[PDB]
Each structure stands twice: as C-alpha cells, then as structure tokens.
Amino acid sequence: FPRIWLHNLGQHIYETYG
C-alpha cells in the first residue's frame, strides 16, 4: 500500500510543482 513510506514520497512532487 502506497500508504507506507511511499506516501510521504508523493509530497516531494508537490514541492517540485509548488
């Protein structure tokens, strides 16, 4: 489940387009 540490990685993308 992406909910694991794979979920915090999605937050990085936001900074790239933030």
Side-chain angles (χ1 to χ4, degrees), residues 1-17:
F1 269 34
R3 185 73 184 295
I4 54 117
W5 58 251
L6 183 74
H7 183 68
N8 62 50
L9 292 196
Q11 296 176 344
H12 183 64
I13 296 177
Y14 186 84
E15 295 183 351
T16 303
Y17 299 98

